[PDB]
Design an enzyme around this catalytic site. Structure first.
Site, PDB file in Angstrom:
ATOM      1  N   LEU A  95       0.825  -1.198   0.000  1.00  0.00           N
ATOM      2  CA  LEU A  95       0.000   0.000   0.000  1.00  0.00           C
ATOM      3  C   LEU A  95       0.867   1.259   0.000  1.00  0.00           C
ATOM      4  CD1 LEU A  95      -2.275  -1.248   2.909  1.00  0.00           C
ATOM      5  CD2 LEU A  95      -2.862  -1.418   0.481  1.00  0.00           C
ATOM      6  N   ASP A  96       0.202   2.404  -0.091  1.00  0.00           N
ATOM      7  CA  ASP A  96       0.817   3.708   0.109  1.00  0.00           C
ATOM      8  C   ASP A  96       0.182   4.352   1.342  1.00  0.00           C
ATOM      9  OD1 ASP A  96      -1.671   4.294  -0.896  1.00  0.00           O
ATOM     10  OD2 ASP A  96      -0.951   5.186  -2.761  1.00  0.00           O
TER      11      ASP A  96
END
Ligand SMILES: CCCCCCCCCCCCCCCCCC(=O)OC[C@H](COP(=O)([O-])OCC(O)COP(=O)([O-])OC[C@@H](COC(=O)CCCCCCCCCCCCCCCCC)OC(=O)CCCCCCCCCCCCCCCCC)OC(=O)CCCCCCCCCCCCCCCCC
Ligand SMILES: CCCCCCCCCCCCCCCCCC(=O)OC[C@H](COP(=O)([O-])OCC[N+](C)(C)C)OC(=O)CCCCCCCCCCCCCCCCC
Ligand SMILES: CCCCCCCCCCCCCCCCCC(=O)OC[C@H](COP(=O)([O-])OCC[N+](C)(C)C)OC(=O)CCCCCCCCCCCCCCCCC
Ligand SMILES: CCCCCCCCCCCCCCCCCC(=O)OC[C@H](COP(=O)(O)OCCN)OC(=O)CCCCCCCCCCCCCCCCC
Ligand SMILES: CCCCCCCCCCCCCCCCCC(=O)OC[C@H](COP(=O)(O)OCCN)OC(=O)CCCCCCCCCCCCCCCCC
Ligand SMILES: CCCCCCCCCCCCCCCCCC(=O)OC[C@H](COP(=O)(O)OCCN)OC(=O)CCCCCCCCCCCCCCCCC
Ligand SMILES: CCCCCCCCCCCCCCCCCC(=O)OC[C@H](COP(=O)(O)OCCN)OC(=O)CCCCCCCCCCCCCCCCC
Ligand SMILES: CCCCCCCCCCC[C@H](O)CC(=O)SCCNC(=O)CCNC(=O)[C@H](O)C(C)(C)COP(=O)(O)O
Ligand SMILES: CCCCCCCCCCCCCC(=O)O
Lengths: 172, 165, 71, 122, 86, 173, 124, 64, 12, 128, 459
Positions: free
Chosen positions: E40-41
């Protein structure tokens, strides 16, 4: 000391989403407009130079201020909520237990034995943690409000007493 | 219970030698009370759950149920019992136009319907930034924003600068 | 939990209900509606008015004392 | 009502003044004008302790209603004919006031008519 | 009101995560780093934090939320804030 | 009773006899029978016991009689003894006047409550009596100040009488 | 930055931003959490006026002048329309309400000796 | 037992003291308890004297 | 579960 | 854009609307770091005394004493009679006194004139 | 009055001849006994005064003041014995001697039948008061406070001495009774104007009048607790009592000479109530509130009505009790944290619950909540002022609003909120402190049952 550009973009993302949620109310409508808002934030996700990225942030903040909900939803126990700081009138400090009459304490022998154990812990560990603070703080004093862990076996993290022994969130 | 005082109150205010603006304002507020009752019901009870997933809903307590029940029976029958047991402390308004007799019902129905139309619109997949009338109403006419900041600031600032120093 | 666990909390589900609360709510809503219906049956005048509103324009000048314009 | 519009956004000199009417003599165009009759005596109203504003021309029905209300306790449902008699008397009184207002208006319009015709020829 | 255990916090934290389409339920672990392990970010992490806030009905400040890079840190944070020791 | 009926008048009390026009029992009458049984009779008995104790220990107190002394008009200027006695008499008279006004205001209040909705017409006599006694009291004791005296009151009366005589002489013309 | 030296007795006391305590960060760990103050840091000259029990300077959604205009316009419009409704009152098409016995001359407290000027109502 | 003890100690004793106070001390002075006189209607019989209030005159007979 | 409640001395 | 927010003394400029938050120079970064260092030094000094097991009493705060001294005892040593101070002293000390004297004197002279001609009714004013 | 004066004088030999550790016990016991005896002076007559001898008399104005003084002495003794525990035996006996001397002087001041004797006894109160303030005060500011208090009072008092001897030379007597019975109207001339000013200014500065009040914050703040108690409770009342006595020779000059003083006090009550809203010193806030109540007393005495005098008497009594209570309550916190700064020790209700209750009672009485005698006095003065001029209701209503605001503000800031984290020495309230507050508050509320005991001789 300061907030980085990434941090500010993230704070604005969270705040704008929460005010969008306060406007939309219903969960499906909030989901739809939240995905639209995330698309807005993803449009300039990879921007070359930070000057126009910061200008985008400025424009977004001006827009947020114009379009913010006058009364957004606030979690009840969060600042500005309806239950915010409702339980301070029950948070008696732990030093009041020493001024109890000896007849009050005798009703709680096991607890006050454990309390004497904790007090002996605190009294014993204090000198070697002031020491560690001296040996770790560079000349000129501390630069950040951070504190170190205990680094050797047997020691306790410095200035731990009032963090560890703080009143419970629902004390009385 | 509210019909045996409030309806007669609207009847009397429509029939009196009154300030015209005050009459119009009380009628409009009679629409708005139905509007905000609609808001309470529509958002608290209708629709879908919007509360956290850990469901703790439990109204099964004899104290709660019984106290609310006693005031419920009051809210249903108290007007009829008290109206017919007090003596006549006034003269009645026996003759008024039909559109004036149903004025209160008509305005509260209008408020109900308009609030229902507006509340149902919140289900639409449209989002618009608030108008200035919404801002005036929601921030309470800015009366606390002005009058809790300006007079108190000037009083306290004077109380230090000129009164004491 | 503790003492008094008659209604066990549920996760992401509709809450447990008792017969008494449903029966009482139903009975009292029915009571309010019966009272409105019965009172409307017996006291329509409190909603519709009791006596006809007269029409002033239908009053004869002799019943009103307006003489012809030559008196 | 329409009288408010007729007086405010029109000719108010054709419309009655609620504070000052009646401004025509009660015997003008009303021969054998009969004075209203009082039933209840002042003393009867006094010891019935009627509110002063309740001591109008229908107060005998009010006194009958009060007596029957006292004599029907705790049957607060009985004594319902008396309330209707008082209400109907009050309704008749209100129609009398409407009649007076309309006579005022139809005499003011006719006053304007008569002066206007007199000024038409000279 | 019922109390809160460590296991209940862990269960609900994993529950919310398993309903996120960007996370693989059969790859989700309490030690899975949101950035590294799950890919993810930090915008996804912001959304994860808001999901936790809605789940538990309280707010996690942004200074503290930005450091919760793992489900286990999330349960540790909730346990510290709610005074659950189990 | 102890108070005298003339100083504290009350009209002849006139109650309507019960005229039931119903068959449902009157709750008030039974709530009053229960009151007379559980409340009135025991306290009534407790009062006979007590007035029986007080009857066998009877003893008296008296009203204090002050004779009249010369007032401040009879005091030679600076005659401190006569001024003292006249001033004490004047202050006593002032207190008695205050109590007279208090009696009349008591009558006025009692009439207003007693007459119900017809008080405006039925209490004209008490309003008139209050008007008269309050005017007289105002003339005697108004505007004297915190340091009032018989001398200041007499000076005010003389100012009033000079004004009255001059007004009469100029009205006669 | 000190206050200007204008003879008001401020001395060298620093002139801090005139910001209320309600504007301080509530998520920070203050030494005094309620006052949102840290030990040893310079106290604003106006601390006891800017405490959260008192004058708030917090930024608002609508700007101050616009709120003043809207509130003042609302109040002025209401006052003007009340005066207009006073000079343009609402009433019913009825003649005056009639009472017997010379509009209740005695019942209203008229002098029982002086005879009132007769007030006669008529069967219309 | 709880309700009877509560009733006597919180209702019966206080009402005893209050009734004694009013009946033998408060009403031993004039105008202390002054009661608005009962309304009197035509027809009424006065308890004290025994007089019968005359009935009103015949109504002008408005018919609904 | 019962917890120790911290309160000031009420004895005096 | 959108309608501008205008800051005021009682409704100030929010941080997110402040242009200085978006033009940050390296010297601004150094100033922020120095502010953080001062704050951390004060925090460390307070927390050392705070967490001391063998401290009893109140941690004396020099900032508090400076604040209470500046507001009471430092004012007259640093006051000067200037046109501003003298004008303000005359206006706020003497102005209200003569204003209220004029108001009350006018009211009481009107009252006394009414009394002299008996135009003021005091029918039931026997308590003063 | 000798059955009161001589027992008080006997406190000195008893104090000096008692054991070192029986000092407080003996003084407290026998001062309470003397206060019991002083209550018999409340049996007053409707018209005359209690004229015992040629040199002492008592009326309904001075009897409540005498009771207040004799009551204040034991409470003083309970308040003092804490901070004077480490003192030497001789120095404790000297402090007790000063308190006894002050009480004896006050007792003879309130009963002196002659104006010059009243002057000497009212001036004598300076000496033990000044000694207390300057010797047993805590700060270096006690010396300047003593100088301010001394010289303000003396600059007021010396012209009064000149005026009194002139009056004795022209009238022949300074006897209060003779002065009343032989009262001459005061003509309108510069001579009489300055005689009025001389007769009034000493009591004006004593109360104190707004503008002449700058000694009071210094003196009431720097003094030890017993000194503050007496200064607020009985010493301010010397100006009001003397003004009530001496205004009987100033008419009708008081009609227009009071305008500057009426304006000063009516506006300065507003000014000093506003100052309380911003005071950062608790003792200073309590000291500043005395100025507003005394301004009300000034107005009441200057308008010269029976209702105004009744209200002024009741207000003086109630303020004495309430201000002494507030000073004691502040002193209990000062003895714990060794500071008078008000926001130093916050959230005290969760540490000292019954002391928080005492604080609430004291604030409520300072609020003039009905039916307290504070409210009775204030309301009577307000009604008399309304009769004097209707426009007075604006200023007095403003003042009661501001008084409510600052009283409840003090309550909220000291008692409510969150306790201070680093203050870990708030020990439980001693029986002595709780008894001090109880003996302040109980007679205050009991007076509501018999309000005529403090309504003065015009009741
Ligand atoms: C018909 C018309 C009316 C006629 C009658 C008029 C009467 C007055 C009406 C107007 C009253 C308005 C204000 C009401 C009170 C508002 C504030 C409040 O509730 O405070 C509660 C509080 C005590 O309760 P709390 O806060 O729960 O206690 C917490 C403790 O920490 C811990 O407490 P605890 O749990 O350990 O239990 C002990 C507690 C036990 O007491 C209580 O729990 C509270 C008792 C309240 C009594 C009723 C209210 C006060 C009425 C008189 C004042 O006592 C104490 O703590 C010590 C109190 C010692 C002094 C008490 C007051 C004087 C004696 C009693 C007078 C009655 O303070 C008071 O009760 C003092 C009120 C003072 C009001 C200001 C004065 C106004 C003028 C009064 C004139 C009275 C003349 C006649 C009586 C003379 C007696 C000598
Ligand atoms: C008695 C009658 C005597 C008549 C004969 C004498 C007349 C001349 C008197 C000259 C006095 C000079 C005072 C000092 C001066 O000039 O400035 C000092 C000061 C200025 O001194 P400063 O500038 O050093 O002040 C410093 C302040 N601190 C300590 C805080 C730094 O003057 C003023 O502030 C104002 C002076 C005049 C104010 C009005 C005074 C009289 C008011 C009326 C009194 C009642 C009538
Ligand atoms: C209240 C509930 C009912 C109580 C019983 C009913 C009777 C009643 O209330 O009587 C009340 C009575 C008066 O009301 P009463 O007139 O009803 O009294 C009844 C008794 N007879 C009929 C004989 C009059 O007043 C008191 O008891 C209050 C006394 C107040 C004064 C107390 C002085 C104490 C001094 C201690 C030292 C402190 C001094 C401080 C300074 C003082 C300056 C003056
Ligand atoms: C508890 C204290 C109150 C006790 C009240 C006891 C009952 C009073 C009398 C009830 C009664 O007789 O109601 C009759 C009413 C009307 O019957 P109706 O429909 O007209 O019959 C056909 C035409 N004759 O028929 C009805 O059904 C009327 C409503 C009956 C139920 C009422 C219950 C109480 C509601 C009010 C509670 C008020 C609480 C506060 C009390 C003090 C103030 C009033
Ligand atoms: C005589 C007859 C009078 C008849 C009057 C009829 C009135 C009908 C009822 C109107 C109800 C308006 C309403 O619904 O108000 C709430 C609405 C929505 O608010 P929002 O916060 O968006 O709702 C939650 C969304 N999730 O928000 C709004 O509507 C905001 C704007 C409200 C404007 C109301 C104006 C009423 C009349 C004002 C007259 C002023 C005169 C000066
Ligand atoms: C040192 C600095 C200056 C001090 C102030 C100035 C004091 C002297 C200034 C003149 C005072 C006024 C005066 O002289 O009054 C005289 C007046 C009349 O008495 P006599 O002179 O005998 O004349 C009788 C009629 N043929 O006398 C009387 O009527 C009796 C007055 C006796 C007391 C006078 C005291 C001085 C005047 C009052 C000052 C203001 C009050 C105090 C303020 C603080 C000072
Ligand atoms: C820091 C200061 C501390 C305090 C210092 C001492 C107190 C203040 C000064 C006290 C001395 C004041 C002496 C006033 C003497 C007045 C003599 C006089 O002539 O009085 C009569 C006059 C009548 O006026 P008339 O219009 O005739 O009345 C109607 C019928 N024709 O009526 C009058 O003249 C009434 C009085 C008018 C003048 C004063 C009005 C009040 C104004 C506020 C004064 C505030 C005090 C400070 C002023 C500083 C400048
Ligand atoms: C009332 C309702 C709301 C009303 C108001 C609604 C306002 C909506 C505004 C939406 C558009 C707006 O331009 C968004 C802005 O501020 S863009 C600033 C630059 N943005 C970048 O992306 C460039 C740099 N890039 C990064 O910083 C990282 O890529 C990032 C953090 C994004 C992800 O990285 P990860 O965190 O590691
Ligand atoms: C059908 C009703 C709609 C709302 C009507 C509002 C106005 C009612 C009162 C009209 C004026 C009464 C006074 C005259 O006529």
């Amino acid at each position: 000391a300061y907030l980085t550009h990434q941090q500010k973009v993230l704070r604005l993302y969270k705040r704008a989403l929460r005010h969008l949620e306060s406007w939309c109310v219903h969960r499906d409508k909030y989901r739809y407009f939240a995905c639209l808002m995330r698309a807005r934030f993803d449009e300039h996700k990879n921007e070359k130079d930070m000057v126009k990225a910061t200008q985008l942030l400025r424009q977004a903040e001006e827009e947020f201020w114009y379009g913010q909900h006058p009364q957004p939803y606030i979690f009840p126990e969060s600042p500005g909520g309806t239950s915010y700081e409702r339980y301070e009138c029950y948070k008696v400090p732990e030093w009041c237990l020493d001024d109890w009459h000896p007849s009050e304490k005798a009703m709680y022998p096991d607890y006050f034995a454990k309390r004497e154990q904790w007090k002996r812990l605190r009294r014993e560990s204090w000198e070697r943690e002031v020491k560690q603070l001296q040996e770790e703080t560079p000349p000129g004093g501390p630069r950040t409000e951070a504190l170190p862990p205990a680094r050797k076996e047997g020691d306790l993290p410095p200035l731990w007493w009032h963090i560890v022994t703080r009143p419970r969130e629902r004390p009385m | 219970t509210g019909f045996y005082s409030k309806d007669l109150i609207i009847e009397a205010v429509n029939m009196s030698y009154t300030n015209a603006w005050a009459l119009l304002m009380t009628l409009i507020a009679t629409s708005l009370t139905a509007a905000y009752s609609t808001r309470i019901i529509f958002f608290a009870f209708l629709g879908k759950p919007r509360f956290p997933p850990l469901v703790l809903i439990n109204e099964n307590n004899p104290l709660l149920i019984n106290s609310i029940k006693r005031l419920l029976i009051g809210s249903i029958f108290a007007g009829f019992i008290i109206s017919n047991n007090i003596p006549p402390m006034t003269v009645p308004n026996t003759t008024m136009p039909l559109y004036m007799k149903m004025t209160a019902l008509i305005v509260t129905i209008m408020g109900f319907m308009l609030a229902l139309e507006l509340n149902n619109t919140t289900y639409y997949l449209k989002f618009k930034y608030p108008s200035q009338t919404y801002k005036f109403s929601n921030m309470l006419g800015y009366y606390p924003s002005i009058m809790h900041r300006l007079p108190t600031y000037h009083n306290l600032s004077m109380s230090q600068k000129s009164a004491s120093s | 939990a503790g003492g008094g666990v008659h209604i066990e909390p549920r996760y992401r589900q509709f809450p447990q209900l008792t017969r008494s609360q449903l029966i009482q709510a139903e009975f009292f809503s029915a009571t309010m509606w019966f009272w409105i219906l019965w009172r409307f049956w017996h006291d329509s005048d409190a909603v519709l008015g009791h006596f006809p509103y007269p029409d002033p324009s239908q009053w004869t000048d002799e019943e009103l004392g307006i003489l012809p314009d030559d008196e | 009502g329409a009288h408010l519009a007729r007086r405010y956004l029109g000719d108010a000199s054709k419309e009655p003044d609620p504070l000052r009417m009646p401004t025509f003599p009660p015997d003008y165009g009303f021969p054998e004008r009969k004075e209203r009759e009082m039933v209840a005596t002042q003393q009867e109203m006094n010891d019935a302790q009627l509110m002063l504003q309740q001591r109008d021309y229908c107060a005998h029905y009010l006194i009958q209603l009060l007596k029957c209300k006292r004599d029907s306790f705790p049957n607060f449902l009985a004594c319902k004919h008396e309330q209707h008699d008082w209400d109907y008397c009050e309704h008749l009184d209100y129609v009398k006031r409407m009649k007076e207002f309309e006579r005022e208006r139809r005499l003011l319009q006719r006053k304007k008519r008569r002066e206007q015709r007199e000024a038409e020829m000279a | 009101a019922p109390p809160l255990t460590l296991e209940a916090i862990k269960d609900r934290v994993l529950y919310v995560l398993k309903l996120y389409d960007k996370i693989d339920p059969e790859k989700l672990s309490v030690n899975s780093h949101f950035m590294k392990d799950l890919g993810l970010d930090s915008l996804d992490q912001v959304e994860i934090i808001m999901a936790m806030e809605d789940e538990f009905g309280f707010e996690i400040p942004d200074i503290d939320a930005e450091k919760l890079m793992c489900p286990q840190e999330i349960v540790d944070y909730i346990a510290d804030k709610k005074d659950v020791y189990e | 009773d102890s108070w005298d009926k003339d100083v504290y008048p009350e009209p002849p009390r006139r109650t309507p006899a019960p005229a039931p026009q119903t068959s449902l029992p009157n709750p008030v009458t039974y709530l009053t029978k229960i009151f007379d049984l559980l409340v009135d009779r025991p306290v009534t008995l407790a009062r006979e016991f007590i007035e029986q104790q007080h009857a066998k220990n009877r003893y008296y107190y008296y009203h204090r009689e002050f004779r009249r002394v010369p007032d401040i008009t009879e005091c030679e200027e600076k005659d401190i003894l006569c001024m003292f006695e006249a001033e004490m008499q004047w202050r006593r008279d002032y207190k008695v006047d205050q109590e007279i006004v208090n009696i009349i205001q008591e009558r006025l209040k009692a009439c207003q409550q007693r007459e119900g909705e017809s008080y405006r017409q039925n209490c004209a006599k008490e309003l008139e009596q209050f008007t008269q006694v309050s005017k007289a009291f105002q003339d005697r004791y108004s505007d004297l100040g915190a340091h009032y005296s018989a001398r200041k009151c007499l000076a005010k009366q003389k100012q009033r009488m000079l004004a009255e005589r001059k007004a009469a002489k100029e009205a006669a013309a | 930055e000190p206050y200007p030296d204008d003879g008001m007795g401020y001395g060298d006391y620093p002139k801090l931003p005139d910001r209320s305590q309600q504007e301080r960060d509530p998520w920070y760990d203050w030494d005094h959490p309620d006052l949102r103050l840290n030990w040893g840091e310079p106290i604003h000259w106006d601390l006891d006026m800017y405490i959260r029990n008192r004058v708030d300077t917090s930024p608002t959604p609508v700007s101050w002048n616009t709120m003043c205009k809207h509130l003042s316009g609302f109040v002025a419009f209401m006052l003007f329309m009340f005066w207009v409704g006073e000079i343009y009152p609402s009433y019913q098409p009825v003649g005056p309400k009639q009472y017997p016995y010379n509009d209740l001359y005695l019942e209203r407290g008229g002098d029982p000796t002086k005879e009132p000027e007769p007030v006669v109502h008529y069967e219309i | 037992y709880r309700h009877s003890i509560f009733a006597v100690t919180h209702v019966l004793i206080p009402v005893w003291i209050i009734h004694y106070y009013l009946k033998y001390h408060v009403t031993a002075k004039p105008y202390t308890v002054v009661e608005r006189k009962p309304r009197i209607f035509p027809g009424d019989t006065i308890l004290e004297t025994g007089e019968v209030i005359p009935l009103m005159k015949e109504f002008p007979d408005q018919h609904h | 579960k019962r917890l120790f409640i911290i309160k000031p001395s009420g004895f005096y | 854009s959108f309608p501008k927010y205008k800051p005021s003394r009682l409704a100030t400029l929010p941080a997110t609307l402040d242009p200085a938050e978006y033009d940050i120079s390296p010297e601004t970064r150094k100033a922020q770091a120095e502010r953080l260092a001062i704050r951390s030094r004060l925090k460390r000094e307070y927390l050392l005394q705070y967490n001391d097991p063998n401290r009893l009493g109140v941690i004396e705060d020099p900032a508090l004493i400076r604040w209470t001294y500046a507001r009471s005892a430092n004012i007259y040593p640093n006051f000067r009679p200037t046109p501003k101070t003298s004008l303000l002293g005359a206006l706020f000390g003497i102005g209200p006194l003569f204003f209220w004297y004029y108001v009350f004197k006018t009211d009481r002279d009107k009252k006394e004139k009414l009394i002299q001609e008996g135009k003021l009714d005091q029918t039931f004013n026997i308590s003063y | 009055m000798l059955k009161i004066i001589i027992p008080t004088t006997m406190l000195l030999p008893m104090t000096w001849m008692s054991k070192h550790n029986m000092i407080w016990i003996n003084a407290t016991v026998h001062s309470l006994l003397i206060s019991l005896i002083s209550l018999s002076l409340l049996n007053q007559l409707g018209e005359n005064s209690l004229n015992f001898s040629l040199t002492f008399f008592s009326d309904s104005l001075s009897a409540p003041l005498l009771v207040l003084t004799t009551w204040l002495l034991p409470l003083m003794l309970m308040a003092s014995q804490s901070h004077l525990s480490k003192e030497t035996t001789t120095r404790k006996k000297l402090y007790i001697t000063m308190l006894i001397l002050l009480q004896l002087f006050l007792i003879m001041t309130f009963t002196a039948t002659e104006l010059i004797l009243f002057y000497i006894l009212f001036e004598a109160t300076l000496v033990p008061t000044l000694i207390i303030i300057t010797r047993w005060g805590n700060q270096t500011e006690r010396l300047n406070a003593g100088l301010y208090f001394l010289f303000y009072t003396l600059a007021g008092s010396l012209p009064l001495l000149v005026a009194l001897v002139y009056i004795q030379n022209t009238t022949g007597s300074l006897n209060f009774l003779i002065i009343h019975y032989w009262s001459h109207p005061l003509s309108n001339s510069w001579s009489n104007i300055f005689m009025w000013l001389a007769c009034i200014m000493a009591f004006m500065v004593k109360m104190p009048l707004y503008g002449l009040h700058l000694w009071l914050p210094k003196a009431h703040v720097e003094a030890p607790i017993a000194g503050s108690m007496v200064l607020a409770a009985v010493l301010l009342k010397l100006g009001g009592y003397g003004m009530m006595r001496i205004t009987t020779i100033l008419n009708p000059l008081t009609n227009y000479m009071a305008y500057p003083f009426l304006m000063l006090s009516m506006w300065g009550m507003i000014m000093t109530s506003s100052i309380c809203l911003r005071q950062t010193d608790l003792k200073s806030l309590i000291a500043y509130s005395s100025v507003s109540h005394m301004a009300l007393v000034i107005v009441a005495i200057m308008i010269q009505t029976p209702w105004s005098f009744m209200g002024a008497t009741a207000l003086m009594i109630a303020h004495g009790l309430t201000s002494s209570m507030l000073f004691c309550l502040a002193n209990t916190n000062y003895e714990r944290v060794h500071s008078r700064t008000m926001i130093l020790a916050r959230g005290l209700q969760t540490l000292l619950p019954l002391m928080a209750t005492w604080w609430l009672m004291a604030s409520l009485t300072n609020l003039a909540l009905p039916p307290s005698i504070n409210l009775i006095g204030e309301l009577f003065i307000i009604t008399a002022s309304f009769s004097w001029s209707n426009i007075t209701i604006i200023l007095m209503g403003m003042n009661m609003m501001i008084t409510a605001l600052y009283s409840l503000y003090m309550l909220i800031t000291t008692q409510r909120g969150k306790y201070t984290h680093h203050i870990n020495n708030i020990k439980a309230s001693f029986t002595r402190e709780n008894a001090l507050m109880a003996l302040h508050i109980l007679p205050l509320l009991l007076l509501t049952l018999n309000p005529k005991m403090i309504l003065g001789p015009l009741y």
